[PDB]
From Swiss-Prot, chain A:
<comment type="subunit">
    <text>Interacts with TRX2, MCP and capsid vertex component 2/CVC2.</text>
</comment>
<comment type="similarity">
    <text>Belongs to the herpesviridae TRX1 protein family.</text>
</comment>
<protein>
    <recommendedName>
        <fullName>Triplex capsid protein 1</fullName>
    </recommendedName>
</protein>
<comment type="function">
    <text>Structural component of the T=16 icosahedral capsid. The capsid is composed of pentamers and hexamers of major capsid protein/MCP, which are linked together by heterotrimers called triplexes. These triplexes are formed by a single molecule of triplex protein 1/TRX1 and two copies of triplex protein 2/TRX2. Additionally, TRX1 is required for efficient transport of TRX2 to the nucleus, which is the site of capsid assembly.</text>
</comment>
UniProtKB/Swiss-Prot annotation, chain C:
<comment type="similarity">
    <text>Belongs to the herpesviridae major capsid protein family.</text>
</comment>
<comment type="function">
    <text>Self-assembles to form an icosahedral capsid with a T=16 symmetry, about 200 nm in diameter, and consisting of 150 hexons and 12 pentons (total of 162 capsomers). Hexons form the edges and faces of the capsid and are each composed of six MCP molecules. In contrast, one penton is found at each of the 12 vertices. Eleven of the pentons are MCP pentamers, while the last vertex is occupied by the portal complex.</text>
</comment>
<protein>
    <recommendedName>
        <fullName>Major capsid protein</fullName>
    </recommendedName>
</protein>
<comment type="subunit">
    <text>Homomultimer. Makes the hexons and eleven out of twelve pentons. Interacts with triplex proteins 1/TRX1 and 2/TRX2; adjacent capsomers are linked together in groups of three by triplexes, heterotrimeric complexes composed of one molecule of TRX1 and two molecules of TRX2. Interacts with scaffold protein; this interaction allows efficient MCP transport to the host nucleus. Interacts with capsid vertex component 2/CVC2. Interacts with the small capsomere-interacting protein/SCP.</text>
</comment>
Length: 49, 49, 49
């Protein structure tokens, strides 16, 4: 697998540009209306049950 | 009947076509040639005129 | 001005000076091109049909 450390995800000719896939139950959004640019975070939260 | 007689106020909005008259050379407009500005990315470049 | 008859106050000279000013209202429209368009515009790979 070739993986991207810093950049966009695209073909050899940038003829197509790939998206990042998030499984639905893992997706979070916290504002009613989003601003133009939004940053993506990965959160791991521990429950002490 | 309660012992008062209230008066109601409301505004209705009407959708209107306008007609506008203006005399010959009533105002003078001065313009420059449009200036083009680049912004560069890996996947697309955008031009602002 | 109009000359006055007996008993009525004669009208004095006046000089009235006014100034007017301009206004500004720039406009902007963008257009954008994809990196594949920029690649294929310049580059001719092997020259096939």
């Amino acid at each position: 697998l070739t993986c991207v450390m810093r950049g966009y995800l695209y073909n050899t000719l940038k003829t197509e540009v790939f998206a990042l896939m998030i499984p639905k139950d893992m997706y979070l959004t916290w504002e009613e209306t989003r601003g133009r640019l939004q940053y993506v975070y990965l959160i791991i939260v521990y429950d002490y049950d | 009947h309660p012992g008062f007689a209230l008066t109601a106020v409301r505004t209705d909005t009407f959708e209107v076509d306008m007609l506008l008259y203006s005399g010959k050379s009533c105002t003078s407009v001065i313009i420059n040639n449009p200036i083009v500005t680049k912004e560069e990315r890996d996947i697309s470049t955008t031009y602002h005129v | 001005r109009v000359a006055s008859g007996a008993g009525l106050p004669t009208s004095r000279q006046t000089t009235i000076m006014v100034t007017k000013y301009s206004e500004k209202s720039p406009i902007t429209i963008p257009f954008e091109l994809s990196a594949a368009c920029l690649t294929y515009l310049r580059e001719t790979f092997e020259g096939t049909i």
